[PDB]
DNA sequence: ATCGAGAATCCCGGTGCCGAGGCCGCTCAATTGGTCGTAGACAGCTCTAGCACCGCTTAAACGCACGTACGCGCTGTCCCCCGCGTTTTAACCGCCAAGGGGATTACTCCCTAGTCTCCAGGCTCGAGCTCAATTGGTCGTAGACAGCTCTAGCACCGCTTAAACGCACGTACGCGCTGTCCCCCGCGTTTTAACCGCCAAGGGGATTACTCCCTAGTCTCCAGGCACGTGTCAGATATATACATCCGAT
DNA sequence: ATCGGATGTATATATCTGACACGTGCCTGGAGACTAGGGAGTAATCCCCTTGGCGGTTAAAACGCGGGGGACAGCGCGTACGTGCGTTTAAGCGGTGCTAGAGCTGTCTACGACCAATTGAGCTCGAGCCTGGAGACTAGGGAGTAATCCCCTTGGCGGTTAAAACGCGGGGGACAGCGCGTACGTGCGTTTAAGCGGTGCTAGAGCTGTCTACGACCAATTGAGCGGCCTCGGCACCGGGATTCTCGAT
């Protein structure tokens, strides 16, 4: 499923970051980085769901995970 | 389910009478207010604990504001807090 | 007569006080603390809304949207410092291209 | 007609820094999120807004990391970002 | 330094007096003037020596100094 | 006061300059040259002092005078 | 002037793990700072957990979840193992 | 004592008192300070174990801050846990980037 | 006065040596001093704030430790 | 006369100071700096000795880490000499600027 | 394509000093070079003077002192006299 | 105009603009461009006076570079001021060393 | 190539005549050429630096005037 | 008829100090300038007035150098300028 | 050294024309008329560093013969080499072209903003409700004062390790060239995500009983902290040990 | 890359010494039973409602292939800067001693926040509009990419003033030699700058507190440089006058 994060999507993300030229090897590297990030956040998020004895990951779980990882997200309170 | 929507909107009408605000922007403003609330209240709590005091007073709030806000924001926030407490007391 | 009205505020002094009592911050909360705190939150809300409104007016929009919040926050050095580790949903980023990338 | 290499790149940079729309396709991102979640807890479901939150977080993180990567590329008197740039940026960030 | 401090100072003060009244001098100002004067004179004497040797002499003479100063643009 | 720049002092200066023999008439010429130099340098130094509204010529004024010459 | 610390417990653990090894005062101070730091992290996260779930009691469940959030990988698994064993021994 | 009932060395009673007086919640369960004390004890034991190993590698019988820094930074998970922590009088790990060597 | 100059060139070199730096540009030293000064200000400001909040006239080690903790640079060993 | 080649003594010093733990800034000049900076915020302050030592530990740990990152940036640019732009990149990526 | 010069002002001065005398293009170029050269010298010295005295403004005093440094003897005295008369007339 | 207010022919405004845009100082006094214009005008007038004199001595009505060179080199203070200056197409003053004559 | 030989013997004689020189050793001419070449190099080098700073490919009169000024040989009339 | 050595020389001095025309041939100097510039950067072009400026500067420099050389020659009680005179002039000027 | 007599040459009398120069239109843009805060600037006051102004002193630099040998100067020539007429060869030059790419402008294309038109999104008036304002008693937390001994601050000084400054200099950084991969742009084909609709049911949220787990009050006696004395490991000191690096040679 | 000598780091080491962490003793406060009260966590239980699912359509984006220009990475070379060391200062520092301000600890006590009702009051949701806004379409514009055309190069065909060379003879360059004026190392007398010191003091630099001069921002304006059109002392030129030089002269 990691291959679903397509090359043009990563290019667009890089464009928003102001990048003008992109090595061919960036894409696979970026995918790896993304997976790690998601794992970490999701690991905390799902943990919160489990403490509450729920089976549905909520927006608050993800926001809380991001906050406790120092990546506080505004707008989904 | 509580929110700051009406108070944010009142402030907006004070600063821009003919300007509105989107739902996403209001949600972001509520998140913002909650964030700053948590930061200031938490720092005030630590100040009180650090000094073996059981009461959070306006002085703890003011010191926390001085710690958390940079420069000009800190000076105006302290000024607004002081003005507000003096107006409230009388 | 409400406490916010006596304090000259728009933010709810009573609600902030209750949130302080129930937020497990201290066993007791002084009467002046929620007035001061509410005043600080109101000041910051007014400042952010001021800049965001300005950005909206530059964009010939009558409603502040998240994009204007990002412009307001990132274009103010001290607000950007206060919210340095905060993500504004649907905010995007500031327009910025490094000089070395230009022709 | 043909634009020179970089002109359209700059146009795309301005275009995507001007806008705010989400840049990853909804369905593959959701599929990835569910795949990763499955390896932590069985039988999980997701609120729609939870996936949208995760997507906002992922793209904001990647855009910031790519900003730093670009600064790292320029630091080496290059204009092309490479994997070693990403690894240095992530090392200095403490990741 | 090769000139005695005090007579050099006396000379400096006399010359300064003809430009502005009531002047005083910092010690390091006089030391600066002395370093500058001695460097200038040694260099001028170097050039004078080159002028003397040019004329197949070993004795420097006023005409040597005057030639050196003319070529320097003084 | 120009005569305070004595004959043996000028001889020592010439020795440092590598001069082996010195006409007797050299000394007055050197004194004149020195005097001219001093006038110019001091004129500039005092000019700077007056601009700074001071009454004490400083070492830095002299250094600046030398630089501009 | 009564100042409490964890010094004796750190020393007892040290004697458990390295019977013939000692420890300097500076190192003991650093260990005390460490224990207090981790105490604050776990207790604070547990408090937040209880608040988040509208619970007024911090139980071993909040402690365990806080440990899982705060500790990395195998450290988290071992800490959870120690905590569970300790709570089960205590209840009996 | 509750620590003895739980088989621990760290003071369960003391941790419980600090929980009551740290204003974390209105109520605290009976099992919470036992678990917390056990986790704190385990982490202390792990750091002291690694630091002792380092101390013996250096032929020293007394643990000093340097051994604590070596123990923490040379173990990936402790280094992660203490990523933003300064160990006073700890120094740094010996490490020279390969390209600078002759 | 001008006390930033007490952070001498050989001291900055030594700090760089501990950081693994082999060669140091001449402009680094002044640059480093500026950075250091900024850092100190940020810490000391917060420290003094705590001192002022406590109505004390002596900055204690605990004020500094707290300033560092709240600036994300938690320091162990002076509690 | 004997002479070590450029870099040998630098490396020896790196090994020496990474092996040891003593503070690298002179005690008294740092103390004077700290007192000056504090005095420009509030007059007549005093300091506990351990407070100044804490500030010194913090400053040196911060600088050593910053110089590590600076070195990584230098090596990235195929240089061996750290430069101001290296410090600025390291601090920009750290989020200090 | 507009190139500014001092030609008309130099020519006006020429008509003041020699009413029935003209000037060649090459000579006009030399006069323009002259004015630009002295401008740079005087302005630069005045800037340095202001810097030396920790002043950020060039006033008639720095210009005057620079003029005294740059011009010889009677030329300096005459230039200073002209400048003072001009500044005092301007102020009134 | 400010030149007229000062009784001058050289352009005070132009000198002021050139001072503002030459990056010489952050601020420029109101009297500085007036003073500068007056000095530049005086020196220009003195050289043109002497060059005209030389031109008339050569029974020429137009000043050419030769007259400028003659004017500058035969006047001690102008020659000093322009000691390191080349007047294009100026030539040199006629001068033969006495020892060279028959 | 070898264009330095274009500074001919009669040209050097004419320049010496304007300088008031009546008699010329046979070795002066080559010596003069060397001196001239050095002079030109020094001027032209500086001129080209200015041209390169301006990112232009044509050396202008102003580049030369600036080179001469900064070498202490200010030339009037080509501004 | 034959003029004695020096009469025509003196006449030539008077002639060229009276006039102002440039004394080096334009085009050979131009080749020299282009050669020297090309040995710094290839394919350079030159403005016409740039070459004339370099030529004016060179001839003014040389005339002044020959003046100083003559003064050094006269100083040594000679009337013929020689290489050591040029070298003395340049040493005192500070060019060597 | 200067008298004359003849001659190449520079300067004066008078002239063609002539191209650079003096004079006029214009537009437009640098120049200037008011205006505002704003910081840079002027003005006063201190006071002490350091400048000044002099009373011995003394010892080394300065001054007066001195005579005396060294270098300046002044001719006397020999030989070299350099000015000057003359001619001839030729590269400088008059004047014209030529391509010779190079060049700021004009043809051409999609891009970004302008203008205008029908809607998804929130504004506005009307009722139930948990929460916010009052104030009394109260019980305790904090504000304030007295005292102390703890410790931070100020000052002298040996000596010495470290810091500061100068000399090579060679390992380094920075810049120009260039071979070449390799990634940007464009377009045609294929998925595959977006959209819209409809349903399912499994899990989140509200409701009510209760009982087990947490708290409240309080005595104690035992674990834990404050000293305390001390004996073992750390700091130190010269041995001397083998490990690193520099400088020739295979 | 390997191998020795020669110095030059650290590492191991036996010996000595001293500081401090550990076992011990003592004190006091708090952790643990202990009981009862009450309050929230469990457990259904019930509803509803939100995202899996599927299905179908559709249409916009990801792939892939290709073209081709442009950044990467050596490679080499210039120059020049931090280093290593040496030598000479400079303040750190550990000591030692004084000395007084504040952290702390304790006492006392008016201030104030917490419950407890108690009212009622602002928020919040529902129903009912609606009116700026998204965007749909479209038109001027900003851009490059060539592209015809002027600004600095490069033949060319001689024309032709001048350089190369002879050579030819005549005027210096330099060596010899000599004659003599004159600096200079010695010697002895002197006399004054350096040094120290002691006292009297004008202003340099700093601190402070107001004060006004201009960098802009509009906003309106005439002086002049580009461009073009008459116009005249000057440049080249011929004729002639008056000269500067070279014999001829002792």
Coordinates of N, CA, C and O (backbone and C1' of nucleotides) in Angstrom, one line a residue, chain O residues 21 27 31 36 41 49-50 55 58 71 75 119 121 136 138 149 164 181-182 203 231 238:
Chain O
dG21 P 32.7 70.6 -30.3 O5' 31.8 71.9 -30.4 C5' 32.3 73.1 -31.0 C4' 31.3 74.2 -31.1 C3' 30.3 74.3 -29.9 O3' 30.1 75.7 -29.6 C1' 29.1 74.0 -31.8
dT27 P 5.8 66.7 -25.7 O5' 6.1 65.3 -25.0 C5' 7.4 64.8 -24.9 C4' 7.9 64.5 -23.5 C3' 6.8 64.5 -22.5 O3' 7.1 63.5 -21.4 C1' 8.3 66.2 -21.9
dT31 P 17.7 66.1 -9.8 O5' 16.4 67.1 -9.4 C5' 16.1 68.1 -10.3 C4' 15.1 69.1 -9.7 C3' 15.3 69.3 -8.2 O3' 15.4 70.7 -8.0 C1' 13.0 68.8 -8.6
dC36 P 1.3 67.7 9.7 O5' 1.6 66.2 10.2 C5' 2.1 65.2 9.2 C4' 2.4 63.9 9.9 C3' 2.7 64.0 11.4 O3' 2.6 62.8 12.0 C1' 4.8 63.8 10.2
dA41 P 23.2 61.9 14.1 O5' 22.8 63.1 15.0 C5' 21.9 64.1 14.4 C4' 21.6 65.2 15.4 C3' 22.8 65.7 16.2 O3' 22.7 67.1 16.3 C1' 21.2 65.0 17.7
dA49 P 40.4 57.6 38.0 O5' 41.1 57.4 36.6 C5' 40.3 57.0 35.5 C4' 40.8 57.7 34.2 C3' 42.3 57.5 33.9 O3' 42.5 57.5 32.5 C1' 41.9 59.8 34.4
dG50 P 43.9 56.9 31.9 O5' 44.4 58.1 31.0 C5' 43.6 59.3 30.8 C4' 44.3 60.6 31.0 C3' 45.9 60.4 31.0 O3' 46.4 61.6 30.3 C1' 45.3 61.4 32.9
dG55 P 60.0 74.7 40.2 O5' 60.4 73.4 41.0 C5' 60.1 73.3 42.4 C4' 61.1 72.5 43.2 C3' 62.6 72.7 42.9 O3' 63.4 72.5 44.0 C1' 61.9 70.5 42.2
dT58 P 72.8 62.6 42.3 O5' 73.1 61.2 41.6 C5' 72.1 60.5 40.8 C4' 72.5 60.5 39.3 C3' 73.8 61.2 39.0 O3' 74.9 60.2 39.1 C1' 72.1 61.8 37.4
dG71 P 85.9 55.7 1.3 O5' 85.0 56.8 0.4 C5' 84.2 57.8 1.0 C4' 84.3 59.1 0.2 C3' 83.8 59.0 -1.2 O3' 83.0 60.1 -1.6 C1' 85.9 59.9 -1.2
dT75 P 87.6 71.5 -14.4 O5' 88.2 71.0 -15.7 C5' 88.3 69.6 -16.0 C4' 89.8 69.2 -16.0 C3' 90.3 68.7 -17.3 O3' 91.7 68.8 -17.4 C1' 90.1 66.8 -16.0
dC119 P -29.0 27.5 -9.5 O5' -29.0 28.0 -8.0 C5' -28.9 27.0 -6.9 C4' -27.4 26.9 -6.5 C3' -27.1 26.6 -5.1 O3' -25.9 26.0 -4.9 C1' -26.4 28.8 -5.5
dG121 P -21.5 23.2 1.9 O5' -21.6 24.6 2.8 C5' -20.7 25.7 2.4 C4' -21.2 26.9 3.2 C3' -21.5 26.7 4.7 O3' -20.6 27.4 5.5 C1' -23.1 28.0 3.6
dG136 P -24.7 38.3 53.5 O5' -25.3 37.0 54.3 C5' -24.8 35.7 54.0 C4' -24.6 34.9 55.2 C3' -23.6 35.4 56.2 O3' -23.9 34.9 57.5 C1' -22.7 33.6 55.0
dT138 P -19.5 30.1 61.5 O5' -18.4 29.4 60.6 C5' -18.7 28.3 59.8 C4' -17.5 27.7 59.1 C3' -16.2 27.9 59.8 O3' -15.4 26.7 59.7 C1' -16.0 29.0 57.8
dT149 P 22.3 31.4 64.8 O5' 22.9 30.3 63.8 C5' 22.0 29.7 62.9 C4' 22.5 30.0 61.5 C3' 24.0 29.9 61.2 O3' 24.3 29.2 60.0 C1' 23.3 32.0 60.5
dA164 P 43.0 35.6 24.5 O5' 44.2 36.4 23.9 C5' 44.9 37.4 24.8 C4' 46.1 37.9 24.1 C3' 46.0 38.1 22.6 O3' 46.6 39.3 22.2 C1' 47.8 36.7 23.1
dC181 P 26.5 8.1 -18.9 O5' 25.4 7.8 -17.8 C5' 25.8 7.7 -16.5 C4' 25.2 8.8 -15.6 C3' 23.7 8.6 -15.3 O3' 23.4 9.0 -14.0 C1' 23.9 10.6 -16.5
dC182 P 22.1 8.5 -13.2 O5' 21.6 9.8 -12.5 C5' 21.9 11.0 -13.0 C4' 20.6 11.8 -13.4 C3' 19.3 11.0 -13.3 O3' 18.3 11.8 -12.8 C1' 19.5 11.9 -15.4
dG203 P -18.1 -4.1 16.6 O5' -17.8 -2.6 17.2 C5' -17.5 -1.5 16.4 C4' -18.2 -0.3 16.9 C3' -18.0 0.1 18.3 O3' -17.7 1.4 18.5 C1' -20.3 0.1 17.8
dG231 P 38.7 3.3 60.8 O5' 39.1 2.2 59.7 C5' 38.1 1.4 59.1 C4' 38.0 1.6 57.6 C3' 39.3 1.2 56.8 O3' 38.9 0.6 55.6 C1' 38.7 3.4 56.4
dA238 P 56.7 14.5 40.2 O5' 57.9 13.6 39.7 C5' 58.7 13.0 40.7 C4' 58.9 11.5 40.3 C3' 59.6 11.2 39.0 O3' 60.6 10.2 39.2 C1' 57.6 10.0 39.0

